[model samples]
Target: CTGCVDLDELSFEKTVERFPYSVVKFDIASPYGEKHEAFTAFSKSAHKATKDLLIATVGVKDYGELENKALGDRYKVDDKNFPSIFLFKGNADEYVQLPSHVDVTLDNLKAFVSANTPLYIGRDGCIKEFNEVLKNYANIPDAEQLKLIEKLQAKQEQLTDPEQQQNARAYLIYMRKIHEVGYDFLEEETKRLLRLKAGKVTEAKKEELLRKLNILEVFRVHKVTKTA
Candidate 1:
């Protein structure tokens, strides 16, 4: 519910496959303090460039106004100067749940966006965080994890009674070691990255994190991304 929420497997894939909107909206304010004119010009240009995708400017009402519209949920700013991106429709659902305070479900995504209007892009622009997400995929291949998850699915299919299946799954996930995915993986990764960014990645922490990962029943290798 906080700090870079993770999308479930199917939801993650569904969101990734869509092509983005053509027009990218932005806001900019220069040191000369001509943001109003600059923002207007940028809006016109984005619309012109796209030759489609209607552009709407709220003229900076509230900090969260960027998320006022459904498709603009992914909008975030670089300080107060530059705002960029025309988000895929309802992308905000990936992070925020609906009805002021309620559970998360796909059916209520639109409601969440509408209710959370005037939404400013919160903590969405850190390059390191985004890179960390990408780095994790390389560290742990989706293909390999998918296979294991599929086996889990297979087990689910074997049970005929809904309650029985639920009980079995709860037992496997909550009471056994074979399918337990621990936070140690995430916690160590996060701490390691923090150390690296802060110039404090220690040999001790590195070894500890790596050792924890190495001992995982299913995860035991390093995955590095190729940089161009």
Candidate 2:
């Protein structure tokens, strides 16, 4: 469970789309220092943490033979940052990147996934079955939604982690709010929450707003956001 796929130039384009999300790392074969250590270290624990993600690595050649040069160099960075990384979502080839200043770390990777998707990773705020409830959100019958929410409510009571319990409750709140106010509530509420998050609130309060915003991000309609 704690392993990743070894990718090449041609393999990358094909392998990326195989999962709902993909994280690719391009590094030299005989690389030096901490850069190489970060990804492999993460890869070792990645599978144990998530089931839907693809941790693909493109090993480069510095001496023996030049392989995956085209794939690696296309998204090249300065030599100082030899092992570059990128994230891709859905069944598409187009890729996106995390910020330059953001340090590559295990928690940061989960944070990146939180911002980009509604994945119920161990850290991100979304709950598993609840996120699925949002997919057919508008079309599904209300009775079924209520039944599912209560099911989660029963399980939320069973959760031991503090954040995990809070997220479970928050997702249920948003689910109810959306049903009452309609789907547009998510877009509008997120902006309002963002504004509130800006002022000098208490540390706990800020954390609450941040969590709410993260949940809103999970429930967002991707197609609508893309077009608008």
Candidate 3:
């Protein structure tokens, strides 16, 4: 059951109420287009990635089907953007639509979900440090933030798990960028240069840092991560 709900109008309300967070990936046509295939292929992985978010698929066979009418009416799921992903709260009253610019890929979608949801508590040390930093991220001066970043980076290096590494790396990048640019425009190139000057990132690590930076940039939760 990969936790995917095949919902009609009949089952939609019940399923939406069942989970705290719901991610609906739907298509205007049956089985959808190529992008839909890719979207559906990764739906299971997306479903499993979330802590409690429910993933649902709505394949529109007809206008009367729930897919074509309710979601269609609210989200305007048209032929142009048939295979679209939408995030909804438990009540199903309002939703956050994926921006048109966002690539409808599994990794991007997963990151989007992870970014919106609460930090997964399964990450023990990382989350602990993250919450600590968040408590004073805004009020703390840049110097203190830099010191915290260094401490977090050290913790990041000692981690054996790739998942933890990714989370730590994300936290480090976000703090460093915010510290440098003051949180308005976090340009990756600017963060890259800042780290280079800090002497923390070497030439060999630059490529890896860039890759992780992209992931962290999107997955970074600003209001929570930079809470005062």
Candidate 4:
């Protein structure tokens, strides 16, 4: 998860850029950092590493106050300050309080996180501590709770709806459009470093590609996790 001063700085394209794999949460209210939850990671070599993590940032100001010049829509803010990550990961209804810096985030950052992250409560909030070596990500929407349950359940193999001949045909088309745009920019960006006329491939670029695709439809909220 990336922490920024303003959630509004996170645009649709940016959200798409980090979808499914990464989470982005923002902090609201002053004198913040001290109250966040902490998470940890362990290494195969020896020592365990730790960092503070706050899964959901609640009580953020409304979208009207946030500025998103690129996209005219008001930034999605909430009473719960439920950002996209919670929606994607299925923790919207859960709320945990800020842990005493010395307690929750710090302790869980080690104990709960295995070579992977374990879901644990911290000061009432679901706390996830960072241990760089661990594979940590938010949980997926619970299948049964999905609002589109009837439609998705009827699929031959749970495949998404199709446009004409292809499953997710419309989704594919939009992905193609983003692919074109990202590929073009990537080509130009890599050429400078690769010194070849086109840009070299990089993970950052790959992430960007996924992000553009997400905006068109990849992260559409079709499923329901827990309700707020």
Candidate 5:
């Protein structure tokens, strides 16, 4: 929106036609004259490299109130900290400002757009299915949960994508932990308490439970401190 009107004299109605994907160089001309030449070169190479992506570059001379009124004052670029790039896509109302820390090169700009947009790749259906399994696992009975995990293990072999296979394996490991760790900790704790109450606990066993209880106390204090 910053440089859109200035570049092609495109009205708001014609923005979608002119720039489906836009990279705008917003800067005043007088102070940052070198940036204009640099950005012009960068834009030409980028537009050629990504010809299919509907990418376009624009420059806006961010100046007085009349100029601000033209673009609806969406980007306020002045003397101090006036030079920057903004990326927009697919009739988007908002634009993403480029990260200042990263080196501003053509390759980096392309990479940034690729990472941010879903245009380059399709959504993975396997991930959604695995996520649904995890969300419902807690409501399932113990025998059913074990059966479901086995089904997921088999699903991994069916998956051709390496990422999908890895996630399927992770689902199995996560499910095992959810079932095993809490059950084991509670079982040991209950056994120790029952033996102590019945006056049948051995000295060594008592010391083991005492050590575990001390560790639990330390963890509880640490957890509470974190929240505080």
Candidate 6:
């Protein structure tokens, strides 16, 4: 269902140096579980984002010297670090590992890749154009900020798709709200959404709430809690 390739001992090392960036997860096995879902989510996004990246998995068993036990032996994959991520870049055989402390969500894995590599991985509700504008808006003068907001507003109107407009306007809302109310508004608003999202709600409402949170992540750029 995803572009993720499952590699065993023979196919493991060969897959490296074949792509600009290769991110592989070594786990007990990528069965029908939360780990598989997160890996597949990131795998799909990584494929859509760029063809130069390869997302893969290596499965190892606990009983005997079978399957991918060779690679797992090379890198320590015990109970504490059961499902670990190893990132290989460029032509070099050397690689980096995702920190064990960080949970392997789609966002966290994307953040890890973007931090180590040049690739940019947008969250579910992120808009590339608006994301760029928001990144530098804080350094601009007050008067100029208003102009940018109006300019974005104009762009939003020209969008023919209603769905697209909401995505575009999310940036506008955050920009305008932050401008008048400062970051305090963003803080409180984000907290409110978080609490609501954590509660019981209709699946549709939960999805909308998730989208809102994803859009909020752009302004909260430096808020990723991953460790190297």
Superior candidate under lDDT, 4 versus 6:
6
Q: What clash pairs does model 3 have?
A: none
Against the reference, the lDDT scores of all candidates come to 0.34, 0.68, 0.62, 0.30, 0.49, 0.76
Model 2 Cα lDDT, one tens digit per residue, 66-116: 887777767764436556778888553567777767777767766776687
Q: Write the per-residue lDDT of candidate 1 for residues 1-228, one digit (tens) a residue.
A: 111112322333244334232212233212123433443444433332232222222222234543233233233333343344223343423332222233222223223333444322111111122222222332444454455456545765786655335433432332123224433444454565456546755766554443333222222225333221
Instruction: Output the worst ten-in-a-row residue range by lDDT, candidate 2.
Output: 219-228
Task: Estimate, for each residue in 1-228, the C-alpha lDDT of model 5 and write its tens digit.
Answer: 212234433543256345556665555543235555555545544443344334443334445533423443455433255466666674536567776666556556556667766433112222445554554454456686688778777777788866556545545654665455533433455566556745767766665444444322221211111110
- How many backbone clashes are present in model 4? 17
Stretches > 4 Å off in candidate 4: 1-6, 9-13, 29-33, 37-104, 107-228
- The C-alpha local distance difference test score for the whole of candidate 6 amounts to 0.76
Residue runs of model 5 more than 4 Å from their true location after superposition: 1-13, 16-18, 30-35, 52-65, 69-72, 76-79, 118-228
Q: How accurate locally is residue 149 in candidate 4, as Cα lDDT from 0 to 100?
A: 28
Q: Residue 136 in candidate 4 has what lDDT?
A: 12
User: Best candidate, lDDT-wise?
Assistant: 6
Give candidate 2 regions above 4 Å deviation.
Answer: 30-35, 77-80, 123-228
Instruction: Kindly give the number of clashing pairs for every candidate.
Output: 4, 0, 0, 17, 0, 0
As a TM-score, model 4 comes out at: 0.23
Candidate 3: lDDT over CA atoms?
0.62
Error of 4 at 150 (Å): 59
Cα deviation of 47 in candidate 2 (Å)? 1.8
By lDDT rank, best first, the candidates go: 6, 2, 3, 5, 1, 4
- lDDT-wise, the better of 3 and 6 is 6
TM-scores for all predictions: 0.20, 0.49, 0.47, 0.23, 0.38, 0.60
**Candidate 6: where are CA atoms >4 Å away?**
44-51, 61-65, 76-81, 134-199, 216-228
Q: 2 or 6: which has the higher TM-score? A: 6
Candidates 2 and 3 compared: the better one by lDDT is: 2
